């Protein structure tokens, strides 16, 4: 295999050149220049609300744009819209398949989406003249489970799947417009940029990739983790993102530096991360773990600022409101908690 | 609380009533995960769902068959099923080690450590035909078979060749060795010899699920 030898050779050369190019840019470290700022202090959040009603493990949740309504998905095959202020249940949506793995809430609030082992992303119309919630579109074409879906507008949605691909869908026609290929393992998470012109994805190959929505090509690849990446979240200003993996670590990557800036880990932390999110200022990084707990991190100093304890089982999802007013945590004990 | 707030509260209470009605039927149903291989024959025994109601108890078995060959991620969805039904092709010595490795990974997984496994050894007629033929040899793939002796508690069918019984019980004990090596009693293995024309598999699954839940109740009440 002389030709394959030659191609592996060019790739080793380019990967050592890229590594050298990144090394020639690390003048200092993020922890080096943030050593002179005051510590964030101790953060102590309290469970302000507890949402009960799901009959099995909660797999996903998404905050509404108004920071009051949220949708949750559970193993029982049900979608529930909640009023976080009053704990009232606004809608209860039965699902054809009980193996849902993701849920999303349209920024306009008119649609919710879900998907899972059925390999189909289902769109539900919340505002119908008949007064009920009806499935509006079933997006088919993925060969592998749906792991994440996010709305761009009322007619555009980006999905990640278990066939190592991501797709951009036209909801009106139900057809894929762009396909994002290049990952090696299952794509577990995706995160849209604030301007929705780019998005990052984390896959089961210890790698994260940056994609251009319009061009439909990979821009950069970030490889610092050691096991499968389960969560990804963009920095509030859109110039960085954080990832959580099964290596029991959280890492921060910069887009214009093309390398990792900090690692959030401790020798006594041996549990994988299931979800990450940022406070609306970006100073605090919140991560949920397998050990039933969530950790609050000083994102600029890699110091643990607090914990979110009170769940009886694995923390499966995590989210912060668009106004930065509260944090919602889902867990395998079938409850949702709002923290402040 | 304004009138519209009270009406919203009443709607929420109606939703909660519907949720309780759903909770009853959810708790009354037992979910099973069907696992195997291409040649296992589990289809006789892209999600292929089936429902049966042996002795008025509802059972719901799932067969995930629309995914890639990597299963370390989607298999965590089934951490709360009553039992896992593992089907192997007992006559295929070449693929036996792959099945044993998959069984070990399922048994020792962190999220699947509490699930009991019902083991079906499917193609026993083909196993008997292959053993009586004499062409293929188990000791080629499993060198320890030469030092194996039939267990004293074995219950062979009358008229069955002792060679067939020895091969059958060696293959069963191969999985039982993995099952008894860890898990310290939180979960158990129920092996069954099966056939393509077996009509009593539902009763076996019913009995195994009954035993699993009875053992769980005994454990939770400090009665072991």
């Amino acid at each position, epitope marked *: 295999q002389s030709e394959l030898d030659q191609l592996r050779q060019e790739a080793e050369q380019l990967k050592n050149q890229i590594r050298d190019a990144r090394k020639a840019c690390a003048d200092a470290t993020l922890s080096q220049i943030t050593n002179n700022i005051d510590p964030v202090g101790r953060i102590q959040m309290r469970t302000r609300r507890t949402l009960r009603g799901h009959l099995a493990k909660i797999y996903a949740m998404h905050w509404g744009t108004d920071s009051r309504l949220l949708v949750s998905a559970s193993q029982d095959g049900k979608l529930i819209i909640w009023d976080s202020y009053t704990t009232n249940k606004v809608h209860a949506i039965p699902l054809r398949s009980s193996w849902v793995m993701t849920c999303a809430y349209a920024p306009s609030g008119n649609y919710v989406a879900c998907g899972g082992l059925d390999n189909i992303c289902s769109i539900y119309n919340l505002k119908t003249r008949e007064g009920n919630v009806r499935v509006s579109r079933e997006l088919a074409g993925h060969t592998g489970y749906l792991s994440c879906c996010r709305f761009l507008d009322d007619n555009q949605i980006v999905t990640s799947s278990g066939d190592t691909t991501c797709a951009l869908w036209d909801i009106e026609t139900g057809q894929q417009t762009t396909t994002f290929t290049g990952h090696t393992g299952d794509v577990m998470s995706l995160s849209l940029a604030p301007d929705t012109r780019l998005f990052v994805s984390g896959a089961c190959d210890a790698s994260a990739k940056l994609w251009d929505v319009r061009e439909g090509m990979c821009r950069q690849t970030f490889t610092g983790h050691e096991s499968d990446i389960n969560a990804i979240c963009f920095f509030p200003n859109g110039n960085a993102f954080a990832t959580g993996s099964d290596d029991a670590t959280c890492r921060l990557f910069d887009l214009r530096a093309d390398q990792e800036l900090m690692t959030y880990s401790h020798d006594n932390i041996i549990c994988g991360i299931t979800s990450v999110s940022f406070s609306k200022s970006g100073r605090l990084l919140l991560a949920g773990y397998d050990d039933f707990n969530c950790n609050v991190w000083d994102a600029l100093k890699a110091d643990r600022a607090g914990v979110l304890a009170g769940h009886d089982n694995r923390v499966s999802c995590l989210g912060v409101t668009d106004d930065g007013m509260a944090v919602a945590t889902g867990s395998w004990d079938s409850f949702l908690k709002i923290w402040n | 609380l304004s009138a519209e*707030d009270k009406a919203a509260v009443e709607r929420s209470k109606m939703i909660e009533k519907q949720l309780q009605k759903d909770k009853q039927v959810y708790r009354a149903t037992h979910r099973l995960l069907l696992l195997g291989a291409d040649n296992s024959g589990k289809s006789t025994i892209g999600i292929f769902e089936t429902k049966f109601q042996v002795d008025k108890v509802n059972f719901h078995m799932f067969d995930v068959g629309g995914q890639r060959d990597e299963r370390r991620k989607w298999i965590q969805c089934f951490n709360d099923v009553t039992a896992i039904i593992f089907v192997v092709d007992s006559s295929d010595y070449n693929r036996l080690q792959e099945a044993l490795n998959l069984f070990k990974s399922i048994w020792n997984n962190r999220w699947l450590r509490t699930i009991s496994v019902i083991l079906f050894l499917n193609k026993q007629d083909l196993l008997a035909e292959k053993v009586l033929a004499g062409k293929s040899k188990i000791e080629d793939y499993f060198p320890e078979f030469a030092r194996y002796t039939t267990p004293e508690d074995a219950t062979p069918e009358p008229g069955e060749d002792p060679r067939v019984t020895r091969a059958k019980y060696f293959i069963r004990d191969e999985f039982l060795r993995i099952s008894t090596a860890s898990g310290d009693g939180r979960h158990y293995c129920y092996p069954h010899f099966t056939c393509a024309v077996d009509t009593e598999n539902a009763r076996r699954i019913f009995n195994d699920c009954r035993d699993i839940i009875q053992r769980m109740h005994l454990r939770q009440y400090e009665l072991l």
Partner: single-chain antibody
Amino acid sequence: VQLVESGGGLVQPGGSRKLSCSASGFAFSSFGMHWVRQAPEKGLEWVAYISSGSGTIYYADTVKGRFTISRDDPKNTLFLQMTSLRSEDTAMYYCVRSIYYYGSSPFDFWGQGTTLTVSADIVMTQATSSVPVTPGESVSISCRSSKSLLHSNGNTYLYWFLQRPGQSPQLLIYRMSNLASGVPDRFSGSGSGTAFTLTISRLEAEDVGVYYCMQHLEYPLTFGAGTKLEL
């Protein structure tokens, strides 16, 4: 979505009569129902209300003890059993659907109505009961309440309805600022506690009619006298 009323007729000064409203085209079980009458020489008047699931039933003071409201969800029908009918009960009765959750739009659809002929409340005041307009111009109408409709929830429970001549009234503005689905953007709702205004910029044809302001703060719902937009 359709609401059809039947059962009206001419009764003695006193007697019994049952009114039925058959619903089709929507999830009848998920909606709360209202009965609204309109005397031939008066405006709209709330009569009775039955909640979704029949858990809450309210009546007006003028009909308490004489009228019974009921629903049969299997057949998607609403019933109004009227007994001891009086001379003041000659009106056209509407069945109105109303759904109640965060962000919902109550009183969105009104039925056609059936005509019946006999042989501590908020006062809603609508001044200037007649306004002449010209197409292509901006007009504005105001409605005042005895008590402030702000609830400290941030919500002002003031509703605007337009009734075209010969047709049923239709929702325009719900909760004093939100435009109902299917309404032109020319309509605008604004105001404060006890003082509300509805603005119609560049009014066109089919905008003529009687505009009613309704409150949904405490359940003895009261309507306005009507503005009676003219030409």
